[PDB]
Design a protein around this ligand. Structure first.
Ligand SMILES: Nc1ncnc2c1ncn2[C@@H]1O[C@H](COP(=O)(O)OP(=O)(O)O)[C@@H](O)[C@H]1O
Lengths: 444, 96, 109, 97, 85, 96, 109, 80, 96
DNA sequence: CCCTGGAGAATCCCGGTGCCGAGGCCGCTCAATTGGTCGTAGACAGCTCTAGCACCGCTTAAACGCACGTACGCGCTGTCCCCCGCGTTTTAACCGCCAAGGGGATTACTCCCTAGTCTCCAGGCACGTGTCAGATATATACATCCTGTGCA
DNA sequence: GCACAGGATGTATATATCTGACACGTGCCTGGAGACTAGGGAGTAATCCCCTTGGCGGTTAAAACGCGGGGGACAGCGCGTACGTGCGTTTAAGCGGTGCTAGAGCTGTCTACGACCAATTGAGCGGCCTCGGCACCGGGATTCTCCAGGGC
């Protein structure tokens, strides 16, 4: 009883079934005067659905009101290109650059009022909050809505300060740690409906409450590809130096302030501590692997996988651990590619393109777990090694799906290294609780 | 409910309105004024206690306070402060 | 019956807490006995010093064409006055700056 | 051909500017790292408040400004315009440090 | 097996910062050897003040240094500071 | 016979005989030593009182005295004085 | 009956009067209460400082071929030791004189 | 009385300078030294007289002088 | 006739007076000066001999320290003669 | 243009005098002992807000390295007058001595001023809350350096 | 070799906007005021005698005055060097977030051990005498230094 086919304003393509039904849901949401969250996993055209919604609201309903889209800086060019490609009728402008460019833009394009859609970023919004305050915005779209999940944050406060008539949250994972984040998002959406702080008494009541405010479609509508991932947990034991340092840290000159943060890397590698490594000569020979159980298992596994399918991704939460891994790979004469927070943007693209060549000698790609900008199409890999585990299960899920992309043709192995009788067991238990909460709430 | 913290801010504000009716004062300047009052109080009280100990007494009187004021303040300030304190003591003892 | 309460500050004509001064003197471990007129004298002295500093700071603020006193105005008032400069010689005022002063040999000629 | 001020007019402009302002002239993060390094030698496992480091920075800047004033006076006494470690050491020796 | 040191923390007090302090002091020309001397003087002053502050904190049976401790240390050194309590 | 005056003269003489067994002192030097003892006593006691007020206590203890000697004496003197004072307190606790 | 009186100085093995120090602390308006170990600690510190000064002064008097310590010897001992010089920097010793010291510029070349 | 600062003579000022460790003295040093001595003595005597008046005595005592010197930061050992 | 060079006798006097320990000003003129200065603050004042001696000792020490600092200033100026400018610089750096 | 050779000053070595430090005796008052009690600080439990540790992203001001030119620090020289060493004459400090009286120091007595307690109430402090002063931006007007250029 | 005009730079001045901290209003509770009783501290009077002041005479060391000369202060000159000024590049500071835990401050309770207070006392410590040894004074013979003259 709604738009059953691709609209007329959309050019260069016909919208598929999931996006047309999502557009129908957004139209019904606007008609009923409700703001909602669109969580269509990671890559089934959420941008396309938002663009189609804006085109509908401009054409089929003669309301040319201003619209704002908040996006990460990395996605600005993609958003503008998509706006020019799919719905060229609307006028979309972007605010980027330093003070002179910002002032020139606001004086030339923004203030006169020829624009219809504004595609800015978080930082530019914080810089130009005073200028943006004046307009009476109609539609406020927030890509990667998990950015405002924490109240008392400046972005959330500023975005709530604004004056709007419609809102739309665009996230991939709404629930990450606890229901307070979901309440914050729903408070931004409908402050009147949700104003207080907070399987029939639960689960079902949550589902029936959140159903008219959420629309999620897991990556199973299309499928026909993407062999399922196999996850194996490998348990390792502390080496002698790891055991001694663990006991010394627990009982108690280097400072040990965050004891959990010291126990962590102590599980990763004692070489991260000052003075644990042997003397000044500073050689790299066989006392690096034997001093860490994870290193021993990794040295057993990597040659095996290289004789096997190879193309292994190693995700870690520590750049120091990445340095030690780089030293090990250089000793073993593998090909290591590194992607880190300190890697410049040009180097990132070159590294990913070189690792994704149709025939390349690259074997190990080393990434920081959260350094990815939710892109990085490493579809040529086979094995994902989580050297260290994060509290947030969604971060690990994204690390895994950087190799579980659409272009994948071979099933992926996820090797999760866990130390026995350490704090990593507590970390894994916390992650399991969070993942179970997220599954029972959203995934069902 | 946070604990009670005592300060001279109310009285400094009263004196500010007395001497410059259309004037304000920021919070950091209030902190500076409070610290100044505390420091001067401590100096005068310590000098008076030392005077009492020197003269082998156990009571801090207006004589001790006046002598401490004369010892700590440089000249014109000292004499004007002596006049002010004598006025206050005379008014206090007049009918109270 | 019971007469209405009247503060010693009110009876002395002061804008400072004579009673709080008395309590602080008795709690400060200066002497085992405190006279009745000592808190009055001390309150009057503190009031005079505060009035002097506030008047000078307000004059500085009016010179800078502002109606709120800031630590810069307090520093400008404390300096430029020999009595208060001598009284507060070893005192540092937070973000109070320094007096404008350039030595004559450094001036161009 | 390009415009250039004489060697000393920009210095006088900077003197006037920095004697007109009240801000802190030392970078907060380097100063905090220095403070923590110094506190390491006295007690490991030490934590600081934001007010403590601010007070330390204020006191240090005031001390250095006063020292520089005395150093400039000594340099002028030596019939010079450039301040030197000799002047700094003389000022410290007279002050008793 | 990877290591990389950055710099001495005493070098974080930079030459332009020392120049700004000298400008506020009223200095026109600055010799090139002044900076190391100023760094040493600052280090000595901070060492004294921080030693007194840490002594106060240890007496209070605490592991956190407070602005009160800093103020008391400065008052011990004879450099009373107003504006922090 | 006028009033009685207290001095540390006999104790200073005992210490002198302990240190240099066959040396003497003059009246002026003894007066200087008495003044020094009084001055050091005043400094340490005042600092301990300040510490007690800062921590909102009501008692001066060996911990206050130790903190005061750390604050007032420089370096090696502070270390040796702390060692001697701790020794004395330990012996007095064991023997009482 | 009553046991034989033993001085607290004898119990602590000190040559300085613990009871006198305790009475001076109680009469000095330092705090409401005084602990048992505070007089002992203070007496020990005073004894150590006196011993240090007397030792240095006796050595100086030995170098002067004298058997009595005079203010000149005390001043020499204080000013020739860095720790005691820092402790007594603001102190003038009567009839103590100055250290022999001539700047190298003034010596004949 | 009057004409008493001149009682501090040039040979005495020279002896003080020699104990200070100076070789050559300018001719204008003596009046400057007399002025410095006057200001120092005025401060100390003012404080001592304040102490004596508080004690309600007609005589100025060495203890009063010592107390004045101590409150000026110039502790003197050897007089009480 | 034998005549010493201009500066040898000065060095001899320096060594002699740095070895000695007596007062370098005349006691009766100093006492007259002290009494004259005391006439400004109170009338018919009486003095103990010890009070005048202590005042003279303090004056000697203050002037000796000032002359040392003045000599250092003169040496800094690459001079051997001390000057009122050197004295003023020493006072200003000291804080007076 | 340093090496003897005299003078002048400082230093070691004896011998006689004085006065002050070290010891010894008396008397009193203050510390040691014992007993009793209370209240302060140690110990514990719960809450809430900040600080530390390892990361990521982004923006942009500030540090950094470099080169050129120019005041300036620094050595060097000459001149002159000023301070210094020495001798002579004047002066008042120093020391011993006497004399008189003012005021410091002590004691006895008593009263009145402050500490401590119990009631009672109102003044100050934490908590909300609104709105105006000051910061910031933007565009002119004016005051300052700097240099080239004409001219006597 | 000077004095002025103009250009360029920086700085001061007006105006409009916006925000977050200051100033005000409210409840309540904790500390200040009111009235009263006890007790010891200090005020007052009187006495003693120590110490302070005043005066004098004789020595003599020290200050004042003058002189003759060399050394230091100060002005001028010349140079080559290190610092100021401006510019383009790079770095890291600063701001906004994640994820967790302990530290610290507070409020509120309990409880027990150490410090206060009082009565008795006996030994430690201060004051007064006394005497003998070290410090001091004076005198003589040495060693070192400093200055001048010249044959080095
Ligand atoms: N023309 C298209 N329309 C919709 N989805 C597409 C299109 N082309 C590719 N995709 C899918 O989108 C995924 C990545 O796109 P993404 O940037 O996530 O878009 P969105 O942010 O809209 O989900 C790829 O895995 C690909 O399968």
């Amino acid at each position: 009883t709604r738009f059953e086919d691709s609209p007329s304003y959309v050019k260069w393509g016909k919208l598929r079934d999931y996006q047309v039904r999502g557009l129908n849901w957004l139209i019904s949401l606007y008609e009923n005067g409700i703001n909602g969250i669109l969580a269509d996993e990671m890559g089934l055209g959420k941008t396309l659905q938002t663009i189609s919604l804006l085109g509908y609201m401009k054409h089929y309903r003669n309301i040319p009101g201003p619209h704002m889209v908040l996006v990460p800086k990395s996605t600005l060019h993609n958003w503008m290109s998509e706006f020019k490609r799919w719905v060229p009728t609307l006028r979309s402008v972007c605010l980027i650059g330093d003070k002179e460019q910002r002032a020139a833009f606001v004086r030339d394009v923004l203030l006169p009022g020829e624009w219809d859609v504004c595609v800015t970023s978080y930082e530019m919004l914080i810089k130009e909050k005073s200028v943006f305050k004046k307009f009476n915005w109609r539609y406020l779209v927030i890509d990667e809505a998990h950015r405002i999940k924490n109240e008392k944050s400046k972005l959330s406060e500023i975005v709530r300060e604004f004056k709007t008539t419609n809102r739309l949250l665009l996230t991939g994972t709404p629930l990450q740690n606890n229901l307070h984040e979901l309440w914050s998002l729903l408070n931004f959406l409908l402050p009147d409906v949700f104003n207080s702080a907070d399987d029939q008494k639960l689960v079902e009541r949550l589902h029936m409450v959140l159903r008219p405010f959420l629309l999620r479609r897991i990556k199973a509508d299309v499928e026909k590809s993407l062999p399922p991932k196999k996850e194996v947990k490998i348990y390792v034991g502390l080496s002698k130096m790891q055991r001694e340092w663990y006991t010394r840290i627990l009982m108690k000159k280097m400072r040990l302030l965050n004891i959990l943060m010291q126990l962590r890397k102590c599980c990763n590698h004692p070489y991260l501590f000052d003075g644990a490594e042997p003397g000044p000569p500073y050689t790299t020979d066989m006392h690096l692997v034997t001093n860490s159980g994870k290193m021993v298992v990794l040295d057993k596994l990597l040659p095996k996988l290289k004789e096997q399918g190879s193309r292994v991704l190693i995700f870690s939460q520590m750049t120091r651990v990445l340095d030690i891994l780089e030293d090990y790979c250089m000793w073993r004469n593998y090909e290591y590619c590194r992607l880190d927070g300190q890697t410049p943007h040009d180097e990132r693209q070159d590294s990913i393109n070189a690792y994704n060549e149709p025939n390349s000698t690259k074997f190990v790609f080393m990434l920081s777990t959260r350094a990815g900008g939710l892109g990085i199409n490493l579809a040529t890999a086979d094995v994902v090694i989580l050297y260290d585990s994060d509290w947030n299960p969604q971060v690990d899920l994204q690390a895994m799906d950087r190799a579980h992309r659409i272009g994948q043709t071979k099933t992926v192995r996820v090797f999760r290294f866990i130390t026995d009788n350490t704090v990593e067991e507590r970390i894994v238990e916390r992650a399991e609780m969070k993942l179970r909460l997220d599954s029972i709430v959203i995934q069902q | 409910r946070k604990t009670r913290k005592e300060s001279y801010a109310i009285y400094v504000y009263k004196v500010l309105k007395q001497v410059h009716p259309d004037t304000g004062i920021s919070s950091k300047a209030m902190s500076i004024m409070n610290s100044f009052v505390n420091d001067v109080f401590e100096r005068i009280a310590g000098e008076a206690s030392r005077l009492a100990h020197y003269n082998k007494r156990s009571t801090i009187t207006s004589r001790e306070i006046q002598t401490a004021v004369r010892l700590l303040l440089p000249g014109e300030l000292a004499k004007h402060a002596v006049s002010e304190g004598t006025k206050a003591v005379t008014k206090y003892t007049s009918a109270k | 019956t019971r007469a209405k309460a009247k503060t010693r500050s009110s009876r002395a004509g002061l804008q400072f807490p004579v009673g709080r001064v008395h309590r602080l003197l008795r709690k400060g471990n200066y002497a085992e006995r405190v006279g009745a007129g000592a808190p009055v004298y001390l309150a009057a002295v503190l009031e005079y010093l505060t009035a002097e500093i506030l008047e000078l700071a307000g004059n500085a603020a009016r010179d800078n064409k502002k109606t709120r006193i800031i630590p810069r105005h307090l520093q400008l008032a404390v300096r430029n006055d020999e009595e208060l400069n001598k009284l507060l010689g070893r005192v540092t005022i937070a973000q109070g700056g320094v007096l404008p002063n350039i030595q004559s040999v450094l001036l161009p000629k | 051909k390009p415009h250039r001020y004489r060697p000393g007019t920009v210095a006088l402009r900077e003197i006037r500017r920095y004697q007109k302002s009240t801000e802190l002239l030392i970078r907060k993060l380097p100063f905090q790292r220095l403070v923590r390094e110094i506190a390491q030698d006295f007690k490991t496992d030490l934590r600081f408040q934001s007010s403590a480091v601010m007070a330390l920075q204020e006191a240090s800047e005031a001390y250095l400004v006063g020292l520089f004033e005395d150093t400039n006076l000594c340099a002028i006494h030596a019939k010079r315009v450039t301040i030197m470690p000799k002047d700094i050491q003389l000022a410290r020796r007279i002050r008793g440090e | 097996r990877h290591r990389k040191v950055l710099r001495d923390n005493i070098q974080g007090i930079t030459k332009p910062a020392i120049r700004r302090l000298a400008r506020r002091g009223g200095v026109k020309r600055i010799s090139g050897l002044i900076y190391e001397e100023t760094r040493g003087v600052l280090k000595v002053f901070l060492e004294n003040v921080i030693r007194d502050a840490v002594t106060y904190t240890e007496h209070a049976k605490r592991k956190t240094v407070t602005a009160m401790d800093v103020v008391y240390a400065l008052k011990r050194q004879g450099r009373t500071l107003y504006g922090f309590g």
